[PDB]
Amino acid sequence: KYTGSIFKRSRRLGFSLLENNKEFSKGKKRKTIPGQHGNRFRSSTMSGYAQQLQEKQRMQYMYGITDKQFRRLFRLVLKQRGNLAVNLFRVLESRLDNIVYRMGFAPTRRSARQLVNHGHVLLNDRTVDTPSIILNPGDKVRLKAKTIKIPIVKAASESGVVSPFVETNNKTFEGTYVRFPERSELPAGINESYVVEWYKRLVK
Amino acid sequence: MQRIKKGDKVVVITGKNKGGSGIVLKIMPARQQAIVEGLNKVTRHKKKDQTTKRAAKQSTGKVQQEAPIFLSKLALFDQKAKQQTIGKIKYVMDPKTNKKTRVFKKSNNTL
Amino acid sequence: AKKDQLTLRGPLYGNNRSHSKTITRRKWNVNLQPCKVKTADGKTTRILVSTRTLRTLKKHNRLS
Amino acid sequence: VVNTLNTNLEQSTSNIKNVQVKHLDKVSVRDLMLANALLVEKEVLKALEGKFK
RNA sequence: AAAUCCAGGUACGGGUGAAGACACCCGUUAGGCGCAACGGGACGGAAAGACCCCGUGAAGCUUUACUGUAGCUUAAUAUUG
RNA sequence: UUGUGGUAGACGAGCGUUGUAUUGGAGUUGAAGUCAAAGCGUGAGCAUUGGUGGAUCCAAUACAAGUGAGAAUGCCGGCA
RNA sequence: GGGUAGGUGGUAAGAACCUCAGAUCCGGAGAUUUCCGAAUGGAGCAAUCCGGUAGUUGGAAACAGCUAUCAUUAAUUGAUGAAUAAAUAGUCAAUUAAAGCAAUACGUGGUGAAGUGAAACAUCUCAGUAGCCACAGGAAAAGAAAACGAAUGUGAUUCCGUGUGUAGUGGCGAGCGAAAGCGGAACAGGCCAAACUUAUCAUUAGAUAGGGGUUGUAGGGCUUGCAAUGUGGACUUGAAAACGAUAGAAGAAGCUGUUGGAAAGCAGCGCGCAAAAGGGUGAUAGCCCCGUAUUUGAAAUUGUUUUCAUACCUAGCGAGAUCCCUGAGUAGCUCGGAAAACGUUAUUUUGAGUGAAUCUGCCCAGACCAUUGGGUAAGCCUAAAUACUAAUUAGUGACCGAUAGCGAAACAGUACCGUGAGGGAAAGGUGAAAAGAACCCAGAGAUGGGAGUGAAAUAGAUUCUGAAACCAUAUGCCUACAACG
Ligand SMILES: [Mg+2]
Ligand SMILES: [Mg+2]
Ligand SMILES: [Mg+2]
Ligand SMILES: [Mg+2]
Ligand SMILES: [Mg+2]
Ligand SMILES: [Mg+2]
Ligand SMILES: [Mg+2]
Ligand SMILES: [Mg+2]
Ligand SMILES: [Mg+2]
Ligand SMILES: [Mg+2]
Ligand SMILES: [Mg+2]
Ligand SMILES: [Mg+2]
Ligand SMILES: [Mg+2]
Ligand SMILES: [Mg+2]
Ligand SMILES: [Mg+2]
Ligand SMILES: [Mg+2]
Ligand SMILES: [Mg+2]
Ligand SMILES: [Mg+2]
Ligand SMILES: [Mg+2]
Ligand SMILES: [Mg+2]
Ligand SMILES: [Mg+2]
Ligand SMILES: [Mg+2]
Ligand SMILES: [Mg+2]
Ligand SMILES: [Mg+2]
Ligand SMILES: [Mg+2]
Ligand SMILES: [Mg+2]
Ligand SMILES: [Mg+2]
Ligand SMILES: [Mg+2]
Ligand SMILES: [Mg+2]
Ligand SMILES: [Mg+2]
Ligand SMILES: [Mg+2]
Q: Containing H/E element for C43?
């Protein structure tokens, strides 16, 4: 609104109040801010629950999930018959892109999800574009032919590597399974069940 | 490609002229018309105008010319076939010259 | 304008309430009082400032 | 009236403005009673019995 | 062209009537249609009467009507030893 | 058997227009529109024929309304 | 790049050309881009006038061509430099940004009425609305507890439903009306100052540039050890891949007869469909044409996502010392106002005045005190859910169909009105195809009557259908002694 001349006022005091609030010294912190936030965890003393909370983050991250979707899946499985500690494991492992990554035609789980969303993926009684449909234990997932028309081929090899609860034949692009993953195939990265009781408190 | 070109033999499949054979002299793509010689002969009442060196005479009586015809009413005429018939055409691409060529679907005749 | 040069705090507009709560708009003005200071080699330059900044100036040793 | 959304049946009956195919969770009163004729799958009827309660 | 115009084929006397009638009652008079005139009437035309009253209508103006306020003046306080 | 004058008003039963949903039907051998006539109804209203006209329209049951013009010194257009 | 055999924009015929060495046309990327206009060399009555400087070409010079540059403000830097020795003010030069506009729409802030209601009116309402102004952004604002609040309680902000028209607030009148809790959409918490320490400033630093730190079941610094080499971001550069956007390619199936001016209608016999959406074709076409379903394709530009690597950030649990740091004209208080539902009051804010303390600390739990409990003010940044559509693509409508729908279906903000701001219309349809009536007659001609084209000319340019009021003609009846809603 005039010749404010920030030099004139800033130097005018050299400490005061406004200069120090504003002090051009103000650095960038353009990486400190982001990274530390990122994601944290640890266990504490006063609430105990710290262990449970951290495990949820790991579990949710292992599959690339937003917390809201997880609450829906827990609500679904919660009501049924009884001690369902065998059901929700099948539900959490029934993701199509999870099966596609565990099927072995993608280098990483998120890449498989991207593929699924990009329309690589052919199902049985249906087809698939959304990478979140909950699949049934005994279902087939025939891979497209256009994907093989784009030979990056490197994938097929991973497929054979596999893990015992999935049966897939390389090159021929076909897959199914039975005897749903036991806890051995769900390694000690996240193997606990008191986060489960926690979700009954947070989710009715 | 185009169904009708300038030059190919054509007939009329609807209207007063049925089996009306002629040669297409010119094609208007925008108005979907086609001038075919010998068909749709109209005789404009020719006035007399004298305002130019050529208009000093401009001898015009009962000149009968050609009226344009909708391209839908036209149908390609077969010539290679022993029994000429009216049919539809394809747009096959032969790898011999990589050029698009029209071929009938009730026979195997090119163009 | 009627404003301080050190800070940017200016007038405060409000109501002039009287008996019977009759409303009339009024203006509170800041205490612009001349003041001389020593900055950049002690260069004195008269600056119209609010009494609050003057008290702030007095305690901060600048005013000497 | 179909419970498993067969694709071959949906590939057909789509250029026919007359006939149509629907799931149990998609039919309504008007779609059912406009039919004048309908072909029901055996497991759809059993699923109906479950739904009817 | 114009204002006007509910449809009209549009007399007078006495009476009647929303209380002063071309149209109602009782009588009298009068062939159909123009033209030039003058204004009696059609409570003639133009202007939802300016006068009067009503509206818990408007606006302008006045004052020791009410409530406030610009301005003027006095004191405390800060700049102010 | 007792009834049926009627303003303000209360109540009940219907007509008509356009469109939508289901059925059926007519139409260049002539639909809508539009004019005329010596028809049918208790009322809104509804037909028949002929002329003009040249492409949509009708019947039933429901549904939704910018749904019914005589007046506002009402608006617009035309003509006295 | 795609794509062909036509093209030279509409009222538009003709004349003259271009085009198969691939035209016109569509898409991507570029080139040129007069003057006014933020207008910015100076002015000025907008599309005009008058220049300076440095080059270069003609002239013998004035001069005239051809180029580039010349506004102001702010920041940085350098040079020069007054009153007055120094030093500044000032002056000059260079570099970097700012100007303005629009999306009749959303955001923030400042300012801010009145008509009206209360059946008058002043408190109040209207309403923090209209308007004025400033600043943006693609959203903005808000935001991580000195909090809610009464409990073995929740644990940033934002938005929706309920709580409810409840508690309350109101000349207790008209009226106004939450905050908790609960159910949902989305979810994210970070970073400085001070301690302590390093280096440098006539080191009077009280300043500059680094390491250390970011708190509440207090945190950090001081000294001393164990365990760590990771996980994750609101993150930089690259490489690769995938999904698209900006032109496109292919894309099935019918004949006969009848009315008819014309068949696609009607009837007979057929055919195709992942195509029976639609448009045109002389009537009403699944199979005439263009298309549609479906399968495909990008030289160039661009969007989203993923993978790999790569900068930049990011890390636990102990012991002792009892020492230091934790945001002051600040929080409070007084005098006038305001924000919250509250008409000023516990909480928030401020115009004037005054003014604290430092974890045995400070604030809060609707005056206030004590106990209990909760939380760490006076520093900063923060995606998502949220608000809107001038525009681009596709599409829809028990929406309108020339007095309707935008004022504007036509060349409408035009004609026109006003000095100006401003106000502001009406007007669409020949025929399938102009085949737009050659020729003859009357007339000066327009025009009319024939002829001709056409299914129709009473479809003729006055051009779909053509209602009434209104004006004329005529068959038949009545009417010139007659008082007439
Ligand atoms: Mg007021
Ligand atoms: Mg007149
Ligand atoms: Mg009397
Ligand atoms: Mg009388
Ligand atoms: Mg009078
Ligand atoms: Mg009056
Ligand atoms: Mg009054
Ligand atoms: Mg005084
Ligand atoms: Mg009655
Ligand atoms: Mg109807
Ligand atoms: Mg008729
Ligand atoms: Mg109406
Ligand atoms: Mg080319
Ligand atoms: Mg008022
Ligand atoms: Mg009032
Ligand atoms: Mg923001
Ligand atoms: Mg094609
Ligand atoms: Mg085809
Ligand atoms: Mg068709
Ligand atoms: Mg307090
Ligand atoms: Mg308030
Ligand atoms: Mg404490
Ligand atoms: Mg603190
Ligand atoms: Mg209009
Ligand atoms: Mg009109
Ligand atoms: Mg004629
Ligand atoms: Mg007409
Ligand atoms: Mg007589
Ligand atoms: Mg007589
Ligand atoms: Mg009489
Ligand atoms: Mg009589």
A: strand C43-44
CB contact at 8 A, D9 and D51: no
CA gap B19, B71 in Å, rounded = 15
Element (H, E) at A109: helix A109-117
Say whether the CB atom of A192 is under 7 angstroms from strand G. no
Distance CA D12, CA D17 (A): 11
Closest-CA distance, D12 to chain A, in angstroms, reads: 16
Residue D2: beta bridge partners?
Answer: D23
Q: Which of A172, A167, A197, A204 is nearest to A48 (CA)?
A: A197
Residue C5 forms contact with A (CB below 8 Å): yes
Helix or strand or coil: residue B15?
coil
Experimental method: cryo-EM
Rounded to an integer, what distance in angstroms lies between the CA atom of residue B4 and that of residue B77? 11
Domains and CATH numbers, chain A: 6-91+188-198 (1.10.1050.10), 92-183 (3.10.290.10)
User: Between the CA of residue A51 and those of A188, A192, B90, what are the distances in Å?
Assistant: 15, 10, 72
The token pair at D42 is 């055996």
What CA–CA distance (Å, rounded) separates B40 from B59?
Answer: 23
Structure tokens, B35: 């001038």
What spacing in Å lies between the alpha carbon of B73 and ligand 19's midpoint? 14
How far is the centre of ligand 23, averaged over its atoms, from the C-alpha of A20 (Å)?
A: 18
Q: Of A91, A48, A39, which Cα lies nearest the Cα of A70?
A: A91
For this entry, resolution in Å reads 8.7
* Strand G close to B14 by CB, under 7 A: yes
Alpha carbons A155 and A105: distance in angstroms, whole number: 5
Range 1-53, chain D: CB under 7 Å to any strand G atom? 11-12, 14-17
CB atoms under 10 Å from CB of B89, counted, come to: 20
Strands B74-76 and B9-12: antiparallel
Tokens representing residue B30 in the block = 């925008």
Inter-axis angle of helices A109-117 and A96-103, nearest 10: 120
Per domain, the residue ranges of chain C are 1-63
- Enter the DSSP assignment of B88: -
Nearest alpha carbon to residue A18 among A9, A29, A27: A9
Distance (Å) from the C-alpha of residue A12 to the closest C-alpha of chain C?
5
Indicate the Cα dihedral angle A36, A37, A41, A45, nearest 10°: 90
Q: Left (φ > 0), alpha (ψ -120 to 50) or beta: where does C54 sit?
A: alpha
